[PDB]
Amino acid sequence: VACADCHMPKVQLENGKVYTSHSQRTPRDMMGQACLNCHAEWTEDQALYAIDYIKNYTHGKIVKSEYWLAKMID
Amino acid sequence: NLKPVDAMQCFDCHTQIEDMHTVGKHATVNCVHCHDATEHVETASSRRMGERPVTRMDLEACATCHTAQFNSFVEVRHESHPRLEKATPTSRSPMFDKLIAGHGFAFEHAEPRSHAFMLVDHFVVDRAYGGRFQFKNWQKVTDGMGAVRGAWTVLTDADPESSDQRRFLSQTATAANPVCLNCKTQDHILDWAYMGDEHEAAKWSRTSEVVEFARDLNHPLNCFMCHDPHSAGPRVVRDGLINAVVDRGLGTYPHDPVKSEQQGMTKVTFQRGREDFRAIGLLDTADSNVMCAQCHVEYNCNPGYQLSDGSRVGMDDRRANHFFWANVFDYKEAAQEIDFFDFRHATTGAALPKLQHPEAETFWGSVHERNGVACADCHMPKVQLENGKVYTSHSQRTPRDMMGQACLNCHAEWTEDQALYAIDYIKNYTHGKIVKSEYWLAKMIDLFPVAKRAGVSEDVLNQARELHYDAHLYWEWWTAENSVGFHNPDQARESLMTSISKSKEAVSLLNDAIDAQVAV
Amino acid sequence: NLKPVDAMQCFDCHTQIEDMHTVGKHATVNCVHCHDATEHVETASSRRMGERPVTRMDLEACATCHTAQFNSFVEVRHESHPRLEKATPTSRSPMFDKLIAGHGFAFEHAEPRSHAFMLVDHFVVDRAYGGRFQFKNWQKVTDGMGAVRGAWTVLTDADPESSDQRRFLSQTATAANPVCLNCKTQDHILDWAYMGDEHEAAKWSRTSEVVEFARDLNHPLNCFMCHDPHSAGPRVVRDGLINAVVDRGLGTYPHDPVKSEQQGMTKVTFQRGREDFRAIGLLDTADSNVMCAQCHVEYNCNPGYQLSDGSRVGMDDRRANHFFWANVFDYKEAAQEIDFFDFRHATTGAALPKLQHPEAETFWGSVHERNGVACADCHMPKVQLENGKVYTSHSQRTPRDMMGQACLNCHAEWTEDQALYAIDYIKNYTHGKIVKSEYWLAKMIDLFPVAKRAGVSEDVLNQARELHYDAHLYWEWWTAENSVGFHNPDQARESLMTSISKSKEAVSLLNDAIDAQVAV
Amino acid sequence: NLKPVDAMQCFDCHTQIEDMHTVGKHATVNCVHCHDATEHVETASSRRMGERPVTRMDLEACATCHTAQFNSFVE
Ligand code: HEC
Ligand code: HEC
Ligand code: HEC
Ligand code: HEC
Ligand code: HEC
Ligand code: HEC
Ligand code: HEC
Ligand code: HEC
Ligand code: HEC
Ligand code: HEC
Ligand code: HEC
Ligand code: HEC
Ligand code: HEC
Ligand code: HEC
Ligand SMILES: O=N[O-]
């Protein structure tokens, strides 16, 4: 998988000539083309929930890392 | 990968193309994008073609550099109901079968849908080819991109081994003829002489076997119908329109000589063996009123009969390819001018015209037309973007889908709901008058068998048939025209009231004559 | 609180029940859930019933352990318009009154609504019981759960003191008879002999007073119509269907002997006093095509007449309970096979069939049926859950309400709007042909009084009446069938074109005969 | 309106560009779309630039034939 697969995927059209989106942005704005095409077992809400589990856990550890760096700095 | 050819070598022979190509916005666009001419260049002389070069007519020839316009063009409007028969109580003409009896449209006449389907819809409608052509299966009806790629990628022919027009199912007709195709495709633009006259250099003409012609055609509404591929400038290619505006000197706006001069057309003719062969009309301005009038007009594209003596007018006659270029109040005179009518009514026996989608001629003289508004302002407006390069939408559809760009930009005093309400007021009032006109037409029609059987004289029946012509014209214009009066509401009202007057006159004539026979 | 009974004690006598119950998925489900048999066990012998045990027929007997299926079943689809008369310009058959004149359906024929209401709707429709039964007030029309709980909890009888069929309001009819109820309820499943024949052990039969029968019945579409309560295995209980498939040897798929063998039915008969009494058909597979064909078929369930001699066929005749089990192109032959027609047209005098909702026979041979698709795939699909135990939806309704589960799972190439557009293309085209068929039928019908009064011969009128039979059949199949052609679009098109051909033939015959009389 | 230049004449001194341009999917795209080289061609030799030709770096140089990619990018 490459950055473009999640951040600038091919446009999906009912009728028309396919082209590559060049709006580089979060996959949350185009989940059908950026995630759900590969993760057929998921609804959009399930895929968003998987992202958020990672980000919530990571951000918690970032906050705890800063707490300890700050205690040391002080 | 495409390799450019030396255009200067072509221009040595093709001076008309040189004059157009080197000056316009396609001066950098190499011939190889649309032509494969290698063997042609090896064998042509200054006056003889030699091997014929290949010319791409597919819309994807333009989609490479103009993807936005192509993609907008091929969109399917699913809200535009498909295959929806007009002769039903819930559509445009509840009494159409009674009123049109005797004409091929009685076999099927559906509402229009998105432009991508025009050629396939022409091929599969029950009134056209006897049911010969069908979609490969009922799922293909959704495939707009597929139809654009080519009619024959989505259709089947019930009998590839014969080319005669015949019925394959009992309730079909074989009304199609080569003239119809001019408003569905221009794939034949190099194989068809001006007006479809017989011509040594034309493979196809008005008198061709239409089934064989059909099989050679693939793409709907080619991009180059409105845009010259060499200069990229605005134009029309439809012979019937050029003939009305230029040959007959009527102008682009027959009611307005000044506008006709400012927004005119220049006929350019191309030759084969130094004889005139085909023509285009370059427009002074990018005037969509005239571009859309290549097809959205009342026309003849069929055999019929002479008003003077009743005799047959066949496909071989020039009248079989004709733009009347007349509003509803000038139409009867325009049909007398060429001595022509379309069919005899199956019940009344009256000589009758058949009217078709006269949007261009209806729009003339309307408040919007008089203020310089054109079809594209309401039906294919500029796209509005927060950040972006503006381009013109090519999805021709009702303005209800883009009211901010199609109406509300000029009507700052209205909300969207107010604008919709104004449209619906006109369409509701107009439709009520269309229904009343049909009621009175049907009442008259129903009296003809009663009058005949009661022994009413030919002289009285003939007087009623003359009234039927006018009653029919002043009604059918409005079921044929697609705006349900919006394009010209005062004209629709005046015309439909005239239809009703004529029918009432005929009903009174027939009732009195029947009563007198009974009294004797 | 329920206390279990000793099933082994029942099984001592009930060996058929033992063989079914001990092997299936209800082997742990005690008899007390559905039967109160204490006094029965005290008094029965191996061959005499003794005191009759109580058997629960209410759907809540299953809702205790299968709440999801019950709750899905009783949902009311409010978008399915209630009490919507089909004989109007905006519904299925704009000219129904003219075309059906002479038949009870002219008094009222509404579109179907949700299954919860089937028994109450049968009781209150104007054509059934002379207006005898009504909802207790106009608010109860919304109460799906109430109707399921029991028809008599939501309806009133205008005269509890009489049991004759008679008119209570002027524009009603008394078409109901005991056979109708077999497709509304199976509360009478232990009180009705196979086919509704007279039988010592049956309280009710084809010849019962229908008002008295009506009063004994409460629940719509009982869960055990498709599910054997003892084995929990798939089955049908409807005698007319078992008679077609098994007794007449026609098979579950008459056009496909192989599929009929793989997806077959086994007739199981239950006796009373060692004589055959009632029967069920156990299915080889859980095949909804055959389950839904208990009701969604063309049938006779009424008196009529013989085609051979015109004589009356009454409720006492087996033909008054009959599944033709024939597609539209085999129907005329199936009606000749039993020598039967339904009514004489009030205007033309023609012997005519009456067709009813033939979804099962229309579906045969369609692209979906040939690919192994069944009614439940589109009308009662598996529920899709992010997290949960999957079960089958029992809300039988249009697939428009669950397109992801009913269409788009098999048609991965389409969006929802594309799929809807494909359905609408078929329904629009089919409806236009239904309207044209009615136009031509009405034109013919209107000529009969003119021809009679002009002195046209019986021989010509009789020829026209024979054409009227076919014109009627090939049209009415499609106003009766609920998919507006979707279930078999090629068949609908061929049949409706045949209807139009037959009417046109009749119109021409009658016009020529009237004209000849006038000329003399 | 753009007027095409003689690309072959450029290639007499620009073999490295020739080998890329003649072979890829822009073989038909004339140099005038992105370069203004009139005075350069008048003054150059294969060994002396002469007047420096102008090269367009604006994204609109691509947006004329690739509007969909450009419009999606600038959102
Ligand atoms: C899908 C499997 C991904 C691939 C491959 C890449 N990224 Fe990604 N990225 C992804 C997610 C789910 C998120 C979080 C977005 C959210 O809304 O929560 C991101 C985030 C970014 C961001 C920040 C975007 C924002 O939140 O606005 C950037 C700048 C980004 N990613 C860049 C990026 C690059 C350069 C990649 C290839 C090396 C790349 N991503 C891969 C999902 C996916
Ligand atoms: C890297 C960050 C990019 C920039 C800056 C631009 N584009 Fe692009 N483009 C990019 C990728 C990863 C792809 C898809 C390649 C693949 O095959 O998967 C593209 C594709 C194109 C195409 C081809 C047609 C299509 O797939 O849409 C064109 C014509 C194209 N890109 C044009 C384009 C223009 C005009 C840009 C400036 C606005 C632009 N690209 C920037 C990556 C990158
Ligand atoms: C003189 C020797 C010629 C050269 C060099 C080229 N063409 Fe030509 N062409 C020539 C003639 C005499 C004709 C018949 C029409 C006429 O003007 O008398 C043509 C025709 C074409 C056509 C129309 C083909 C058709 O199907 O009708 C096309 C598209 C065409 N020519 C293109 C073309 C191109 C692209 C050339 C350079 C590669 C070219 N021609 C060279 C005479 C001569
Ligand atoms: C790329 C190689 C092109 C192909 C193939 C086609 N066209 Fe084109 N077109 C091209 C350019 C670079 C331009 C000029 C852009 C600018 O604004 O400077 C154009 C312009 C047009 C126009 C506008 C003309 C005008 O405003 O005067 C139209 C209507 C147009 N092009 C249409 C068109 C059609 C119908 C094509 C297929 C036959 C087509 N073009 C091919 C680049 C390319
Ligand atoms: C002949 C080649 C045509 C030209 C030029 C234009 N139109 Fe057209 N239009 C045409 C046909 C044959 C059809 C019916 C297609 C079918 O398969 O049924 C149409 C349809 C329309 C519609 C209805 C679209 C819908 O959603 O139902 C509109 C609004 C329309 N046409 C407008 C229109 C405009 C504004 C034009 C000039 C820009 C134009 N058309 C040109 C045939 C042709
Ligand atoms: C241009 C002057 C036309 C000629 C010649 C033909 N048609 Fe046409 N057609 C035209 C327009 C602008 C439209 C859309 C507007 C409308 O009112 O329909 C159409 C539409 C069709 C359709 C779709 C709708 C329908 O009537 O079912 C079909 C099937 C169709 N046209 C067929 C047809 C045939 C068989 C023709 C020759 C007899 C014919 N068309 C000529 C424009 C023009
Ligand atoms: C007549 C019915 C048309 C057909 C067929 C095509 N286009 Fe068009 N185009 C049309 C109009 C009325 C306009 C606007 C002109 C104005 O100045 O108001 C356009 C414009 C273009 C342009 C210019 C850039 C823009 O405004 O979008 C291009 C590049 C263009 N059109 C391309 C195009 C292509 C590729 C077509 C086939 C899919 C196409 N046009 C058909 C009218 C008509
Ligand atoms: C705005 C001032 C308009 C101009 C200029 C033109 N038309 Fe129009 N049209 C307009 C409205 C408000 C409607 C009714 C649409 C609705 O949704 O109620 C129409 C209708 C059409 C149609 C049928 C469209 C449909 O309902 O699907 C066609 C085919 C059409 N108009 C064509 C047309 C042409 C060719 C014009 C220039 C001659 C034209 N219209 C001008 C609004 C406006
Ligand atoms: C032999 C002494 C019996 C025992 C013990 C039970 N039943 Fe019975 N039952 C018996 C007979 C002879 C009949 C008539 C039908 C027949 O098979 O010959 C029946 C009938 C029933 C019925 C049908 C009642 C109806 O309304 O038609 C039911 C539901 C039934 N029996 C249930 C039943 C149960 C639950 C028992 C155990 C508690 C049981 N029976 C015992 C003979 C005998
Ligand atoms: C609880 C005491 C039950 C009552 C009352 C009813 N059923 Fe039942 N059913 C029950 C169980 C425990 C099971 C097996 C669950 C499993 O999957 O193992 C069932 C099964 C069914 C089935 C599925 C049969 C099959 O797949 O072969 C059906 C169709 C079914 N049950 C229907 C049903 C009906 C119609 C009832 C009322 C007459 C009914 N059940 C009562 C538990 C209980
Ligand atoms: C006889 C006992 C029936 C069986 C078995 C099935 N259906 Fe039915 N259905 C029946 C009636 C009498 C009615 C009309 C009820 C009323 O009060 O009007 C219906 C209705 C339907 C509908 C329409 C529902 C709506 O929303 O309008 C559908 C889609 C339907 N039926 C489908 C259906 C299927 C798929 C069946 C097998 C699973 C089935 N029905 C069985 C009578 C009976
Ligand atoms: C099964 C073979 C049936 C017999 C016998 C009867 N009906 Fe029926 N009915 C049946 C189905 C599958 C449906 C729904 C489909 C449809 O097209 O309606 C119905 C519907 C009704 C309705 C509601 C709709 C209506 O026509 O108003 C009523 C009032 C109704 N049925 C009454 C009725 C009477 C009076 C019958 C005996 C003469 C009768 N039905 C028989 C299935 C079957
Ligand atoms: C025929 C018209 C049916 C009626 C009446 C009832 N159900 Fe049903 N049921 C039906 C089908 C076609 C299926 C699916 C079988 C398959 O394998 O595809 C079902 C399934 C069940 C099940 C099994 C679990 C599940 O799939 O949901 C149960 C427990 C069940 N049905 C119960 C049930 C009840 C309680 C009913 C009355 C409300 C009921 N069914 C009616 C067909 C029919
Ligand atoms: C999907 C491939 C289907 C199968 C298999 C069956 N039916 Fe169907 N039905 C289908 C569609 C797309 C429609 C039209 C629904 C719409 O909203 O337009 C229908 C319609 C019905 C109806 C009327 C439903 C309504 O509009 O309320 C009934 C009563 C019905 N179908 C019954 C039915 C039966 C009994 C089937 C098996 C024999 C059956 N259908 C198969 C789609 C599908
Ligand atoms: O009808 N012959 O083309």
Ligand SMILES: O=N[O-]
């Ligand atoms: O049917 N086209 O006017």
Ligand SMILES: O=N[O-]
């Ligand atoms: O009509 N008597 O049941």
Ligand SMILES: O=N[O-]
């Ligand atoms: O009215 N029921 O077929």
Ligand SMILES: [Ca+2]
């Ligand atoms: Ca339309």
Ligand SMILES: [Ca+2]
């Ligand atoms: Ca005409």
Ligand SMILES: [Ca+2]
């Ligand atoms: Ca319904």
Ligand SMILES: [Ca+2]
């Ligand atoms: Ca019947």
